[PDB]
Amino acid sequence: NSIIQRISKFDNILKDKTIINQQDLRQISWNGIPKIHRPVVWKLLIGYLPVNTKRQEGFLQRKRKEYRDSLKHTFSDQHSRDIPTWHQIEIDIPRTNPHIPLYQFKSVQNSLQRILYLWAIRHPASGYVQGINDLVTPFFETFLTEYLPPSQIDDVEIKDPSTYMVDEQITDLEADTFWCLTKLLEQITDNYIHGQPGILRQVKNLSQLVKRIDADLYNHFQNEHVEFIQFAFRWMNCLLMREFQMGTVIRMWDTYLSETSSLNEFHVFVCAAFLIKWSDQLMEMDFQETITFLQNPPTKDWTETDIEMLLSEAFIWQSLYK
C-alpha cells in the first residue's frame, strides 16, 4: 500500500468513470484519504458534490451562486437580530485556532465570519453557538489545499489565501465550506439548538457506556467526584478537535465521513475508546489531576498508527453494541 499506489487507486475510482461508485469510495476512504484527493472525496462523502460527474459543474455554479445571493440578501437588507449575531461571531473568530497562523490572517477571519454568520442566520433555533467556529475549520483548511500546488499542501497552515487566490475563488471556497458545514451539522442538529440537548444526551450516553465496559474507572470517577460533563462536553461539542493536533483531526475526519456517509453514535464510541486508553493512568488521579489530564491529553505526537488504532477499536465496539 504505497503512497503513490494509493493515490492511483483513488484516481481510478474518481476519474474517467462518469458516475462515481460511493460504495467503493467509502470502503477505501475509511482507511485514510491521500491529501491530494481530500477536497473532492470529502465533498462526495458528505453528500455535497454529486456522484454523477456530468452534474457537478452545474451543481457547483448554482450552489456557489446561492451562497453569494444569500449573503447579499442577508446584508443591510432586512431588519432582524442580524447585527448582534454578527458581533457575537466577531468575538470568537479572532480567537479560533490561536496556535495556527492561518487563522490570524484577515482574509481567513473575514471568510469564516461570513460562513458562520450565514449559517447562524439560517438556523434561528440555534443561532451562533460556540463550538461551530471550531467545526468549520477542518473543512475550510482542507478545501483550501485544492488551490495550492500539490507539492505545497503541507504549508496550508502558514500561507495567506489572499496571496494565491483571487476574490472569486475565495468566495467559491467559502460557499463549499458553508454547504459542507451545513451538511455536517444537519446530522447532529439538536447538539446545537438552545440548551444543546444533543450534547447532554451524548455525555449521558458516554457515561453509561463507560459504566458498562469499565465499571472500575466509573466508580473511581464517582469517588473522586469527576463528572463526565467536566471534560466530555468539549469532546462532544467540538468533536474531539480540541484534544488533537489538526493533522490528526483531518485524518480522523476521513473515517468519520466514510463511516457516516450515525455521527453521534460513532463519536460516542470513539470517545469511549479514547478515554479507556487512559484508564490505568486515570485510576491514580484525583479530581484536579483528572480534569487537567483529560482537557490536555498527551496526543501531541500521535501518528497515523495511533489514530487508526483508536478508530478501528471504536468501530469494533460499535459493531458489537448494535
Curated annotation (Swiss-Prot):
Residues the UniProt record annotates as site (Glutamin finger): Q130
Alphabetic keyword roster: Golgi apparatus, GTPase activation, Phosphoprotein
Effect of R95 to A/K: Completely abolishes catalytic activity
Start and end residues of each Rab-GAP TBC domain: 32-260
CC terms in the record's Gene Ontology section: cytoplasm; Golgi apparatus; Golgi stack; mitochondrion
Something else known: Present with 206 molecules/cell in log phase SD medium.
Function: GTPase-activating protein (GAP) that stimulates specifically the intrinsic GTPase activity of Ypt/Rab-type GTPases YPT1 and YPT7. Functions on the Golgi as a negative regulator of YPT1. Functions on the vacuole as a negative regulator of YPT7. It is also active on SEC4 and YPT51. Provides a catalytic arginine (arginine finger) and glutamine (glutamine finger) in trans to accelerate the GTP hydrolysis rate of the substrate GTPase.
Protein name: GTPase-activating protein GYP1
Gene source species: Saccharomyces cerevisiae (strain ATCC 204508 / S288c) (Baker's yeast)
Lineage: Eukaryota, Fungi, Dikarya, Ascomycota, Saccharomycotina
Underlying gene: GYP1
